[PDB]
Amino acid sequence: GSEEIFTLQVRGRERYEILKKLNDSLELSDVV
Amino acid sequence: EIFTLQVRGRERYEILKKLNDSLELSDVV
Amino acid sequence: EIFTLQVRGRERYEILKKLNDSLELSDV
Amino acid sequence: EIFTLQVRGRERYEILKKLNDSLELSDVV
C-alpha cells in the first residue's frame, strides 16, 4: 503493498493552505 | 506558524516537498 | 477565464502541468 | 525553453504563478 504516509512540515498558514489544496486535489484526481 | 501536512504516496510527497522547500527558500508565500 | 502561464524549463513545466491537470479534475 | 500552461480560473492561475515564481527563485545549485 500500500501507499505509505509521509508528513511535511509547513511554515505559514497561507503556504499550508496552498499545499493542502494541492494534496487534496491529487488525492481526488490521482494524477500523482 | 507551523503545520503538518500528511501525504499518501511517495511520488505525491516528493512533488509537495519540492514545492514546500522552494517556497521556504523563495519566500513567495 | 483562461490564463496563459509561461514556464521556463522542462522539469518545472512537468511539475506545474501535473498540478494543473489535477486541479482540472478535482474542480468539483 | 519556454513552455506555456493554459490555466482555467483566476484563483488556480494565481496559485500556479506563485509556485512558478518560487521555483524560478529557488532554482539554485
Side-chain angles (χ1 to χ4, degrees), chain D:
Chain D
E1 301 155 351
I2 299 168
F3 294 80
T4 60
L5 279 172
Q6 293 304 136
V7 185
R8 304 172 185 281
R10 174 192 67 75
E11 189 182 2
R12 190 185 297 172
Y13 170 63
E14 288 289 316
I15 288 168
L16 296 176
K17 272 196 297 185
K18 286 171 178 140
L19 298 178
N20 190 44
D21 291 345
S22 185
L23 290 163
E24 286 179 358
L25 288 160
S26 69
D27 188 0
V28 301
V29 175

Short mmCIF file of all heavy atoms in Angstrom, two decimals, chain D:
data_model
loop_
_atom_site.label_atom_id
_atom_site.label_comp_id
_atom_site.label_asym_id
_atom_site.label_seq_id
_atom_site.Cartn_x
_atom_site.Cartn_y
_atom_site.Cartn_z
N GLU D 1 13.79 27.86 -23.52
CA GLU D 1 12.96 26.63 -23.33
C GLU D 1 11.67 27.01 -22.58
O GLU D 1 11.44 26.63 -21.43
CB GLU D 1 13.73 25.55 -22.57
CG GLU D 1 15.02 25.10 -23.25
CD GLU D 1 16.04 24.53 -22.28
OE1 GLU D 1 15.84 24.65 -21.04
OE2 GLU D 1 17.07 23.97 -22.74
N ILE D 2 10.83 27.76 -23.29
CA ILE D 2 9.60 28.28 -22.73
C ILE D 2 8.45 27.36 -23.11
O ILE D 2 8.25 27.01 -24.27
CB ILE D 2 9.32 29.72 -23.18
CG1 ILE D 2 10.46 30.65 -22.70
CG2 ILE D 2 7.97 30.18 -22.67
CD1 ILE D 2 10.44 32.02 -23.33
N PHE D 3 7.75 26.93 -22.07
CA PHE D 3 6.52 26.20 -22.16
C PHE D 3 5.39 27.13 -21.75
O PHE D 3 5.58 28.09 -21.00
CB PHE D 3 6.54 25.00 -21.22
CG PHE D 3 7.55 23.94 -21.56
CD1 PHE D 3 8.88 24.06 -21.23
CD2 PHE D 3 7.14 22.77 -22.18
CE1 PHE D 3 9.79 23.05 -21.55
CE2 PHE D 3 8.02 21.75 -22.46
CZ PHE D 3 9.34 21.89 -22.16
N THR D 4 4.20 26.84 -22.22
CA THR D 4 3.04 27.59 -21.76
C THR D 4 2.02 26.64 -21.17
O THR D 4 1.79 25.54 -21.66
CB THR D 4 2.34 28.36 -22.88
OG1 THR D 4 1.90 27.42 -23.86
CG2 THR D 4 3.27 29.46 -23.46
N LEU D 5 1.43 27.09 -20.08
CA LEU D 5 0.32 26.37 -19.44
C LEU D 5 -0.91 27.19 -19.54
O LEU D 5 -0.89 28.37 -19.23
CB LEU D 5 0.51 26.16 -17.95
CG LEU D 5 1.37 25.02 -17.50
CD1 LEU D 5 1.58 25.10 -16.00
CD2 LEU D 5 0.77 23.68 -17.88
N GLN D 6 -1.99 26.58 -19.98
CA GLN D 6 -3.29 27.22 -20.02
C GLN D 6 -4.01 26.87 -18.72
O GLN D 6 -4.26 25.69 -18.46
CB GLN D 6 -4.07 26.74 -21.23
CG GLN D 6 -3.46 27.22 -22.53
CD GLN D 6 -3.27 28.71 -22.65
OE1 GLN D 6 -2.23 29.16 -23.10
NE2 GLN D 6 -4.28 29.48 -22.28
N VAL D 7 -4.29 27.88 -17.91
CA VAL D 7 -4.86 27.67 -16.60
C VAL D 7 -6.25 28.27 -16.55
O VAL D 7 -6.45 29.44 -16.88
CB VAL D 7 -3.98 28.29 -15.50
CG1 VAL D 7 -4.57 27.93 -14.14
CG2 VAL D 7 -2.54 27.84 -15.63
N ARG D 8 -7.23 27.45 -16.14
CA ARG D 8 -8.61 27.88 -16.07
C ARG D 8 -8.93 28.40 -14.70
O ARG D 8 -8.86 27.66 -13.72
CB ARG D 8 -9.52 26.70 -16.40
CG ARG D 8 -9.27 26.03 -17.74
CD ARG D 8 -10.06 24.75 -17.93
NE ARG D 8 -9.71 24.06 -19.17
CZ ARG D 8 -10.14 24.40 -20.38
NH1 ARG D 8 -10.96 25.45 -20.55
NH2 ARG D 8 -9.76 23.69 -21.44
N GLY D 9 -9.27 29.68 -14.63
CA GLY D 9 -9.72 30.30 -13.40
C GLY D 9 -8.65 31.14 -12.73
O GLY D 9 -7.49 30.73 -12.61
N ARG D 10 -9.06 32.31 -12.23
CA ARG D 10 -8.14 33.23 -11.59
C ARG D 10 -7.42 32.62 -10.40
O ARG D 10 -6.20 32.74 -10.27
CB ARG D 10 -8.89 34.49 -11.13
CG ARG D 10 -8.04 35.47 -10.32
CD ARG D 10 -8.89 36.53 -9.64
NE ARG D 10 -9.70 35.89 -8.62
CZ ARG D 10 -9.25 35.46 -7.45
NH1 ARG D 10 -7.98 35.68 -7.06
NH2 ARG D 10 -10.07 34.81 -6.65
N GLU D 11 -8.16 32.02 -9.48
CA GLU D 11 -7.54 31.54 -8.27
C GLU D 11 -6.49 30.47 -8.54
O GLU D 11 -5.41 30.48 -7.96
CB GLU D 11 -8.59 31.04 -7.30
CG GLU D 11 -8.00 30.75 -5.95
CD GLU D 11 -8.97 30.19 -4.95
OE1 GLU D 11 -10.15 30.00 -5.29
OE2 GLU D 11 -8.54 29.94 -3.81
N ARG D 12 -6.83 29.55 -9.42
CA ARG D 12 -5.91 28.50 -9.81
C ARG D 12 -4.66 29.06 -10.47
O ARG D 12 -3.54 28.64 -10.18
CB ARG D 12 -6.65 27.56 -10.78
CG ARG D 12 -5.91 26.30 -11.11
CD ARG D 12 -6.62 25.46 -12.15
NE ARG D 12 -7.93 25.02 -11.67
CZ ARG D 12 -8.85 24.39 -12.40
NH1 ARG D 12 -8.65 24.12 -13.67
NH2 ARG D 12 -10.00 24.07 -11.85
N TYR D 13 -4.87 30.02 -11.37
CA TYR D 13 -3.78 30.71 -12.04
C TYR D 13 -2.87 31.41 -11.03
O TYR D 13 -1.65 31.35 -11.15
CB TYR D 13 -4.38 31.65 -13.07
CG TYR D 13 -3.44 32.64 -13.73
CD1 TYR D 13 -2.38 32.24 -14.53
CD2 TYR D 13 -3.68 34.00 -13.62
CE1 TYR D 13 -1.58 33.16 -15.18
CE2 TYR D 13 -2.91 34.92 -14.30
CZ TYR D 13 -1.85 34.50 -15.06
OH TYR D 13 -1.08 35.41 -15.73
N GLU D 14 -3.46 32.10 -10.06
CA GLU D 14 -2.66 32.79 -9.07
C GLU D 14 -1.81 31.81 -8.24
O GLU D 14 -0.64 32.09 -7.94
CB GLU D 14 -3.55 33.66 -8.16
CG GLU D 14 -4.07 34.90 -8.89
CD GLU D 14 -2.97 35.93 -9.15
OE1 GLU D 14 -2.16 36.19 -8.25
OE2 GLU D 14 -2.96 36.49 -10.25
N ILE D 15 -2.36 30.64 -7.90
CA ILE D 15 -1.58 29.65 -7.19
C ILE D 15 -0.40 29.18 -8.06
O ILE D 15 0.75 29.13 -7.62
CB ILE D 15 -2.45 28.44 -6.76
CG1 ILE D 15 -3.38 28.87 -5.61
CG2 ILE D 15 -1.56 27.26 -6.34
CD1 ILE D 15 -4.47 27.88 -5.29
N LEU D 16 -0.69 28.79 -9.30
CA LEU D 16 0.36 28.23 -10.15
C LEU D 16 1.43 29.28 -10.47
O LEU D 16 2.61 28.93 -10.57
CB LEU D 16 -0.22 27.58 -11.40
CG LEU D 16 -1.11 26.36 -11.14
CD1 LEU D 16 -1.70 25.85 -12.43
CD2 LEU D 16 -0.38 25.27 -10.40
N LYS D 17 1.03 30.55 -10.61
CA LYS D 17 2.02 31.61 -10.80
C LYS D 17 2.94 31.74 -9.61
O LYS D 17 4.16 31.93 -9.76
CB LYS D 17 1.32 32.95 -10.98
CG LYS D 17 0.92 33.32 -12.38
CD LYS D 17 0.61 34.80 -12.51
CE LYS D 17 -0.57 35.18 -11.66
NZ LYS D 17 -0.94 36.60 -11.87
N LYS D 18 2.37 31.68 -8.40
CA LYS D 18 3.22 31.76 -7.20
C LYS D 18 4.22 30.62 -7.15
O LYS D 18 5.39 30.83 -6.82
CB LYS D 18 2.37 31.81 -5.94
CG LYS D 18 1.70 33.16 -5.77
CD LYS D 18 0.70 33.20 -4.66
CE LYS D 18 0.14 34.60 -4.54
NZ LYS D 18 -1.30 34.57 -4.27
N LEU D 19 3.76 29.42 -7.49
CA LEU D 19 4.65 28.28 -7.49
C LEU D 19 5.73 28.41 -8.56
O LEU D 19 6.90 28.11 -8.31
CB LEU D 19 3.85 27.00 -7.69
CG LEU D 19 2.82 26.70 -6.60
CD1 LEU D 19 2.08 25.44 -6.97
CD2 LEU D 19 3.45 26.56 -5.23
N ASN D 20 5.34 28.84 -9.76
CA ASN D 20 6.31 29.07 -10.83
C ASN D 20 7.37 30.09 -10.43
O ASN D 20 8.57 29.86 -10.62
CB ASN D 20 5.55 29.51 -12.08
CG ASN D 20 6.38 29.56 -13.33
OD1 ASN D 20 7.17 28.65 -13.60
ND2 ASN D 20 6.15 30.58 -14.14
N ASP D 21 6.93 31.20 -9.88
CA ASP D 21 7.85 32.23 -9.46
C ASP D 21 8.78 31.72 -8.37
O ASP D 21 9.97 32.05 -8.35
CB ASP D 21 7.09 33.46 -9.01
CG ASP D 21 6.39 34.19 -10.18
OD1 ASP D 21 6.72 33.92 -11.37
OD2 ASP D 21 5.55 35.04 -9.88
N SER D 22 8.23 30.95 -7.43
CA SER D 22 9.04 30.34 -6.38
C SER D 22 10.11 29.41 -6.94
O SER D 22 11.26 29.45 -6.52
CB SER D 22 8.14 29.59 -5.41
OG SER D 22 8.88 29.08 -4.32
N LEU D 23 9.71 28.56 -7.87
CA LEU D 23 10.64 27.59 -8.45
C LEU D 23 11.73 28.29 -9.27
O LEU D 23 12.87 27.84 -9.31
CB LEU D 23 9.88 26.56 -9.29
CG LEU D 23 9.03 25.60 -8.47
CD1 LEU D 23 8.01 24.92 -9.36
CD2 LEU D 23 9.90 24.59 -7.74
N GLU D 24 11.41 29.41 -9.90
CA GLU D 24 12.45 30.21 -10.56
C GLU D 24 13.45 30.72 -9.52
O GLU D 24 14.65 30.62 -9.70
CB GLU D 24 11.82 31.37 -11.32
CG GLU D 24 11.12 30.96 -12.61
CD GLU D 24 10.47 32.11 -13.37
OE1 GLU D 24 10.53 33.27 -12.88
OE2 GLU D 24 9.90 31.87 -14.48
N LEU D 25 12.95 31.28 -8.43
CA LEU D 25 13.83 31.84 -7.40
C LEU D 25 14.64 30.78 -6.66
O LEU D 25 15.77 31.05 -6.25
CB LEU D 25 13.03 32.68 -6.42
CG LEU D 25 12.53 34.01 -6.98
CD1 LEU D 25 11.36 34.55 -6.18
CD2 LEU D 25 13.67 35.02 -7.03
N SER D 26 14.08 29.60 -6.45
CA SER D 26 14.78 28.54 -5.71
C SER D 26 15.61 27.64 -6.60
O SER D 26 16.21 26.67 -6.11
CB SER D 26 13.78 27.73 -4.91
OG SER D 26 12.94 26.96 -5.76
N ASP D 27 15.66 27.93 -7.89
CA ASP D 27 16.49 27.17 -8.81
C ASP D 27 17.97 27.55 -8.62
O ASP D 27 18.50 28.43 -9.30
CB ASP D 27 16.04 27.45 -10.24
CG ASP D 27 16.70 26.55 -11.27
OD1 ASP D 27 17.53 25.71 -10.90
OD2 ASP D 27 16.34 26.68 -12.45
N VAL D 28 18.62 26.91 -7.65
CA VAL D 28 19.99 27.20 -7.27
C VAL D 28 20.76 25.88 -7.30
O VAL D 28 20.17 24.80 -7.23
CB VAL D 28 20.08 27.85 -5.86
CG1 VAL D 28 19.28 29.14 -5.82
CG2 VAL D 28 19.59 26.88 -4.78
N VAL D 29 22.08 25.97 -7.40
CA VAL D 29 22.91 24.78 -7.45
C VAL D 29 22.78 24.02 -6.14
O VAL D 29 22.85 24.63 -5.08
CB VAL D 29 24.39 25.15 -7.72
CG1 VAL D 29 25.28 23.92 -7.65
CG2 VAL D 29 24.54 25.85 -9.07
#
